[PDB]
Amino acid sequence: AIKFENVSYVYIGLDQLNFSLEEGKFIALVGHTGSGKSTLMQHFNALLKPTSGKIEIAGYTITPETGNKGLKDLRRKVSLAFQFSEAQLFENTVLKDVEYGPRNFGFSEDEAREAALKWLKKVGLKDDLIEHSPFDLSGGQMRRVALAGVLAYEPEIICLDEPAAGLDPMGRLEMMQLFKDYQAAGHTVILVTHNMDDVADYADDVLALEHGRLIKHASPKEVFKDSEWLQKHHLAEPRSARFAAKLEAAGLKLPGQPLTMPELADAIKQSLK
Amino acid sequence: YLPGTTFVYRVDPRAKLLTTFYFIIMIFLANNWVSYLVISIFGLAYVFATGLKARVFWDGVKPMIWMIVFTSLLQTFFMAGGKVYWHWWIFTLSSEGLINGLYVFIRFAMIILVSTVMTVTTKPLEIADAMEWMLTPLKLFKVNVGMISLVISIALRFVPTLFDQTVKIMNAQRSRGADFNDGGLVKRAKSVVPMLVPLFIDSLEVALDLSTAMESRGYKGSEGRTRYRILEWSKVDLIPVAYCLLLTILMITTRKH
Amino acid sequence: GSDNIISFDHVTFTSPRPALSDLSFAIERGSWTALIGHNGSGKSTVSKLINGLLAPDDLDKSSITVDGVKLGADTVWEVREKVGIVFQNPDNQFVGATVSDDVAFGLENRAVPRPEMLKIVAQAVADVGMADYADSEPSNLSGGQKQRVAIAGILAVKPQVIILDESTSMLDPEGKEQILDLVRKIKEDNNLTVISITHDLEEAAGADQVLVLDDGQLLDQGKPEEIFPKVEMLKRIGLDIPFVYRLKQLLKERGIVLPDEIDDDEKLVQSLWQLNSK
């Protein structure tokens, strides 16, 4: 249960955060460009320790005076996947690069290899491509390996910066499906995307932030109930939501606000019936 | 760096750089009490003309005190003698060397002092094209200067981006589980060097993409260009010139001959 | 007529498999033609192939005849003048110290007098919409804004073809619409052909022509309302049909049929309203 009390980072600026994210649910952290998402990014595993308040994360405690000793346990419990992972590839062998994750948390060689193979299989890639150099991977494939290195050691909380930045829609859909399947196992994903349609499709808790402060924290069905609020706070809208607004501007009634594609289809089917 | 309204920020950066070079040659040239005081008063007059706070120069000078004090002590003890206050078990504790010792000290100080203003009055791009203008007479050689100026201007803005990419990959690797800073120098040979290659290849890819874009926008060499950003000599640009000339007089009427 | 023609061409990078093979197509004059397909196998190389950066492996069978000037090692720079490109990554393409210097880079390279350079760069920056950032440093600019400046650099030179090589891939789905609207308005005003090589099919949904690339070979060419209904082909190739056609498919599975002439939100709201009325 992630818990932030009076959390504020100074010297991008973050001030006076107060919230509680539960376990076993999707979390989407939406915010304006450079409005505090990147600063709240690194506090989830004490890359940048807070200058006030308290953070509670899976039984671990984070306070401004905590040192760098013993943070490996926290970084095991909570993992980060930074944006444009194609530049963080490290080892000479793809298998070695993926197993480099578990090798820093006491995992034995056999179990590290087994986890690496299992997670490459889950991300798919190819079975015969696990031995070539990571630099030889072709474009989007280079992404698919990197996430494995973050997802190898089954972190309890995984926090994702934009993973689908620059991927074809089929690849983005497959990646989001994989993340949702991982979340279904009992873990939590904290996904950050400007792309609002992904947030509308796959989320349960939405954390709307701007100007380095927290404003809204509620289910996606509630954050999109007032288009004037979204326009005022410079936050986009789901594509299905814009279609529903355009359709309602034509004088056609919709039974409830839909967010995803099947919801809009069912709503208009009910309306015509 | 620090902006302001003082007249120094109005004059041509090329004139600033030429005056700085002339001043450094004079400070390397003056070698007696009277000329040393001449250069000192000229430098302090220049500082007061800039109108900046003394702390702005003091804090900049602070990191560079080790080399100047070490050189001053080394050259003082190399020739000192004469009066002695106390005698230690080995060192004689000579005192007459100061007759030039601190002198050399203040020399380097003035050097840094001038360098200080040179890095606070103009943004780096201005210094870059001033360097290009100063090296323009090098065109008699086969090597051209326009391409060098362009690549310097490019690098002066990519370098912060490169460092940001380096700190980003540092944060990513730390989040993965790696340990870099508190592992000691023995663990640095297994932490930073194998990480070095991907950032280098990323920088090479960035340079290649920039070269491709520049060549696709019509970069037919660097000889037929017509510069957009230009700096012209103003009438106020005369005040550092005559100043310089005055020092020349006050350098030729008091030289040791 | 026909502006840019590539026919009987095939390229191998420097090399285990031909990326482009037997590609043959044409571009209409003053029309929005967009190339779509799976990543690699042609999309990433067409832009650098059109203006003679890359070269066909066999120059004997070359047929690049952009604007009637058959491309070759002798006459590359004429094509460079006649074709502009907006590249994918915006950060590592913003050459020059600041705005009003990046935008005037082409004019600086063309050896034109300075006052005319100032006039043209000011007018182009005003046209794009970066008037308030006429002297901002690139660091202050945030993402999509940079791309706008790049378009200005293409617009100042007065080109005849603008090639967007996945120019909207690294942007949020909001600024992408802004850049698309800007490009459409520029195309309407200056009367210049636009070729948009993008994987995102929102651009292709509004294009006049769309070309599908399978493995380096053209597979189908036509209007978006003529090809996108063939959803099985796009699914097998590895592409997902756009918003309006995906919605039409969902209603088709939901039990209600719609005409295939519908192409966007307009006339689709009309069809639904008429269906409810009728």
Residue numbers in the entry:
A (entry chain B): 2 to 12, 21 to 282
B (entry chain C): 9 to 265
C (entry chain A): 1 to 14, 18 to 281
Question: What's in the article?
Answer:
Energy-coupling factor (ECF)-type transporters mediate the import of micronutrients, such as folate, cobalamin and pantothenate, in the majority of prokaryotes. A tripartite ATP-hydrolysing motor (ECF module), composed of a membrane-embedded scaffold protein (EcfT) and two cytosolic nucleotide-binding proteins or ATPase subunits (often hetero-dimeric - EcfA and EcfA’), forms a functional core complex with a membrane-embedded substrate-translocating protein (S-component). Structural and biophysical analyses of ECF transporter complexes from three different organisms, with different substrate specificities, and from different laboratories revealed that the core complex and minimal functional unit exists in a 1:1:1:1 subunit stoichiometry. Based on these fragmented structural insights, a model for the transport mechanism has been proposed in which a substrate-free solitary S-component with an outward-facing binding site topples within the membrane upon substrate acquisition, associates with the ECF module, and exposes the binding site to the cytosol, thereby moving the substrate across the membrane.
The ATPase dimer adopts an open conformation, and the structure of the module is very similar to the conformation observed in full ECF transporter complexes presented above (rmsd: 1.8 Å), as well as to the ECF modules of previously determined structures of the folate-, pantothenate- and cobalamin-specific ECF transporters from L. delbrueckii (rmsd: 1.6–1.8 Å). The main difference is that transmembrane helix 3 and the regions close to the extracellular side of the EcfT subunit in the solitary ECF module are less well resolved. We attribute this to a higher degree of flexibility caused by the absence of any stabilising effect typically exerted by a bound S-component. Notably, in the solitary ECF module, the docking site for the S-component remained structurally intact and unaltered compared to the docking site in the ECF-FolT2 complex. In the ATPase open conformation, the lipid nanodisc has a dramatically increased thickness around the empty docking site. The observed thickness of ~50 Å in this area is needed to avoid the exposure of the hydrophobic docking site to the aqueous environment. Moreover, the imposed tension by the convex shape of the coupling helices in the closed conformation may not be energetically favourable and was captured due to the mutations introduced. Thus, the solitary ECF module in the open conformation likely represents an energetically more favourable post-ATP-hydrolysis and relaxed state.
